[PDB]
Amino acid sequence: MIDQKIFETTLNIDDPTNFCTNVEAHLLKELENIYVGKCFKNSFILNITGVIQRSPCFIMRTNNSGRGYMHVRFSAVVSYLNAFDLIAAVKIIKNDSNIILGESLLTEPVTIVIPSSESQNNVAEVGQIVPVQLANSSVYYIPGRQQASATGSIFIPKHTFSVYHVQEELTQEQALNLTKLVNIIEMLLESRSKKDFKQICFFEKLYYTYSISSDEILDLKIWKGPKGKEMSRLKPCNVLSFLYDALKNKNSSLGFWARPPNLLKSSPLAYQQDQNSFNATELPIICSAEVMFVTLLKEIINYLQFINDLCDTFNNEQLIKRHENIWMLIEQRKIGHDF
Amino acid sequence: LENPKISTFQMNVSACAWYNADFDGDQMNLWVPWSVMSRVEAELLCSVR
Numbered sequence A: 001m002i003d004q005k006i007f008e009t010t011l012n013i014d015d016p017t018n019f020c021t022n023v024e025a026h027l028l029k030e031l032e033n034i035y036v037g038k039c040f041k042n043s044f045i046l047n048i049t050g051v052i053q054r055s056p057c058f059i060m061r062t063n064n065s066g067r068g069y070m071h072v073r074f075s076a077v078v079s080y081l082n083a084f085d086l087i088a089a090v091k092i093i094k095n096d097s098n099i100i101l102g103e104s105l106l107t108e109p110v111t112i113v114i115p116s117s118e119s120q121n122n123v124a125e126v127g128q129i130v131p132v133q134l135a136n137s138s139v140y141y142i143p144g145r146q147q148a149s150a151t152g153s154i155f156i157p158k159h160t161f162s163v164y165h166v167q168e169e170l171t172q173e174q175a176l177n178l179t180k181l182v183n184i185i186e187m188l189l190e191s192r193s194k195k196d197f198k199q200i201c202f203f204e205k206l207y208y209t210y211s212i213s214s215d216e217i218l219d220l221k222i223w224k225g226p227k228g229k230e231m232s233r234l235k236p237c238n239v240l241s242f243l244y245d246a247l248k249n250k251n252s253s254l255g256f257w258a259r260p261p262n263l264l265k266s267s268p269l270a271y272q273q274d275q276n277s278f279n280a281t282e283l284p285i286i287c288s289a290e291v292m293f294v295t296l297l298k299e300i301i302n303y304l305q306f307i308n309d310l311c312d313t314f315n316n317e318q319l320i321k322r323h324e325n326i327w328m329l330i331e332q333r334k335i336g337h338d339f
Numbered sequence B: 001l002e003n004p005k006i007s008t009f010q011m012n013v014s015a016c017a018w019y020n021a022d023f024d025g026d027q028m029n030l031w032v033p034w035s036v037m038s039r040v041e042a043e044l045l046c047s048v049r
């Protein structure tokens, strides 16, 4: 994602008399020159928001250098990648027998090294831009490096889903906490609404778990879902509306919550029931409203970001055709309407 | 001492009370501070006065 992080450092000043003529400007300059674009304390620094707190310019005591040092506590905009996240663009630069090495394009500088399996070396080639799925805690931020190393898998949308049993209500202050995620989704939506309809539609058709016979997948202003023969007797519920209602405390958030693959991952819709009637292959997890809401909101943000990044990367159809081979490799993994 | 034939450290006889020294063959160490900080405190702190 992208958020704020507070760091503490000690800067060495090689010319204290000059540095102290303007401490704020020199301090910002040195923090930017040292930390911008590097990994430090399990994070990747993007921008220097400011200096929260500093110390006097002490003169170094254990040597005769006459040099100074200053303790700085500063706030920086950083980007921490989560486990099993989903990037949309990577340029594979190295394709050997042992490993595959690519670099992210849209997001911040990231190196993705896919261990080479026998089913991978015969497909991916140098020059292709593909989406990748991450892994658990494999995003080690080795300090001082200009990229976040992470192992990944070529993304094929799954056929499974999770079910969360919530027995505690979503309170008002935790709704205030999730307001930030709701606002992030609103910004992502208003950024997506500018894009051409054809690109978003084709990318959604490619990455939808099933197939649908055209012009039946998207209602941008209302998000009414796909009109496939009314598969479920219960209409999926908008997450944003439910959160705004729980802000005023008119609805209850108890029961079983699930997001089956038939649902559009990028939409704010989801399924709620009072009884466990979801056809999941895995046991539902008993958890509170906080965890379930956080997980669902984070999945929505991740998939909205994925669709936005896919639409940004491929602005022309010629590149789509150039990457059509990956599209069909995705396509053969879809599930038909034999149900 | 710019005479090239002199190899001894020469000092006034009234300074020997500091070092409990005499001139029967005693040897003494001498180093010249080259750093600025070491040079300042030699003159302000450690002067024999």
Ligand SMILES: [Mg+2]
Pocket: B021, B022, B023, B024, B025, B026
């Ligand atoms: Mg003697």
